[PDB]
């Protein structure tokens, strides 16, 4: 059946180029066009352009025409998109989608190829314990945290007590802050459990081969 398989995520420096691919299957490639679409968070969706591989004819949204090249190899049922002179603005997820005049649109989309444009170097995160500075009065429970600051690239993986403690966990998506990634996780336990029992945040950053196992200790006596 109909599938559009996009190439893997790319990391690129400002000023460089990338070229991604979109392998089509489950249909006669020459009977359809290939559309491309950009997505940035809360920027919504932008139409890039399309190619008709049977002729090689292309059409671009004027905004993308200068730095974007759509090509296709009919013989391998694969469409390509080349982004040049990359800036932070080009950090996004890009989709290919099959255009069909009978349908009047794009019925099938690829899974997306993430492009990160960054001058950052590989950096292990700093891991900070987040204890309460104040006891919670109505609180029978307690919420502890772990701040994972200033790493590159993604991902990190975070567990508590080496996986042992997985109930009441919320591990959040990373944000970009001063050109490095930050995330956090919280775990909620009953107040009788901590600090009588140790709770450790275990962070692994495969890129840098670094693991950090930070014990959450309470603040000093008040």
């Amino acid at each position: 059946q109909v599938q559009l398989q996009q190439s893997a995520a790319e990391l690129a420096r400002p000023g460089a180029s990338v070229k991604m691919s979109c392998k089509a299957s489950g249909y006669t490639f020459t009977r359809y066009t290939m559309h491309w679409i950009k997505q940035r968070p809360g920027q919504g969706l932008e139409w890039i352009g399309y190619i008709n591989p049977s002729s090689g004819y292309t059409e671009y949204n004027q905004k993308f025409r200068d730095k974007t090249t759509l090509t296709a190899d009919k013989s391998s049922s694969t469409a390509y998109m080349q982004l040049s002179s990359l800036t932070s603005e080009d950090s996004a997820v890009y989709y290919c989608a099959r255009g069909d005049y009978r349908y009047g649109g794009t019925a099938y989309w690829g899974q997306g190829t993430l492009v990160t444009v960054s001058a950052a170097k590989t950096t292990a995160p700093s891991v900070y314990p987040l204890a309460p500075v104040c006891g919670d009065t109505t609180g029978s429970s307690v919420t502890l945290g772990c701040l994972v600051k200033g790493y590159f690239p993604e991902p990190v993986t975070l567990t508590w007590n080496s996986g042992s403690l997985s109930s009441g966990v919320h591990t959040f998506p990373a944000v970009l802050q001063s050109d490095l990634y930050t995330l956090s996780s919280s775990v909620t336990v009953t107040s009788s459990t901590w600090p009588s029992q140790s709770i450790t945040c275990n962070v692994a950053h495969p890129a840098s081969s670094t693991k950090v196992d930070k014990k959450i200790d309470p603040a000093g006596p008040s």
Partner: protein, 215 residues
């Protein structure tokens, strides 16, 4: 160029019918705009639903139907299901290019609405030793999955050095988000009160600390 506009969010319940609409800034939507609708589900899974105004994509359930309703294009979901909780985008064709609307976030309640649980963490002394301070405001168990976040330092709105995650779905199918305020240690030591305020369904839940007190 042309601007395409959709409702920003809609809430429905399993078994009900919902109508999403799509407006062209230039005038009426007509079949010459070949309105498309596409669905976005978590982890950037996009499924085409409708093309050419009313053509249903193969393998899409019949409860999805596209039409014109006077001067707008519309998607009607008859007997909405919990798995229809997703973002819906319309796209209009303008002679030689497609333009997308902003998307509608559809909630299909699989449980009652839930207000957010907010926790504000202060900077660790470990982090302060580096001359940097990060406040962390975690925000869990809210439904529908949309919130806005406002910070205040000594009562005044703070815009700079603030970053917030997009909401994401928890395993209990409510949603979570986190927000960060980043200051220097000197800026942290310079002010006393810090507030993270989360607005959900037009109601505000707030969490505060003073660096002087447990008030």
């Amino acid at each position: 160029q042309a601007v395409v506009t959709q409702e920003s969010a809609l809430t429905t319940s399993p078994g009900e019918t919902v109508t999403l609409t799509c407006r062209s800034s230039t005038g009426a939507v007509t079949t010459s705009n070949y309105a498309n609708w596409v669905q976005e589900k978590p982890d950037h899974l996009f499924t085409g639903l409708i093309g050419g105004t009313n053509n249903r994509a193969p393998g899409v359930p019949a409860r999805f139907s596209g039409s014109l309703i006077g001067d707008k294009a519309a998607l009607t979901i008859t007997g909405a299901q919990t798995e229809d909780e997703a973002i819906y985008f319309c796209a209009l064709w303008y002679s030689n290019h497609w333009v997308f609307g902003g998307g509608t976030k559809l909630t299909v309640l699989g449980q009652p609405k839930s207000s957010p649980s907010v926790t504000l963490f202060p900077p660790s002394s470990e982090e302060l030793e580096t001359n940097k301070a990060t406040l962390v405001c975690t925000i869990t168990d809210f439904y529908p999955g949309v919130v806005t976040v406002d910070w205040k330092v000594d009562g005044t709105p703070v815009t700079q050095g603030m970053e917030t995650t997009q909401p994401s779905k928890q395993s209990n199918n409510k949603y979570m988000a986190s927000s960060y305020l980043t200051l220097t240690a000197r800026a942290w030591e310079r002010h006393s009160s810090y507030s993270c305020q989360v607005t959900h369904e037009g109601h505000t839940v707030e969490k505060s600390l003073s660096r002087a007190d447990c008030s």
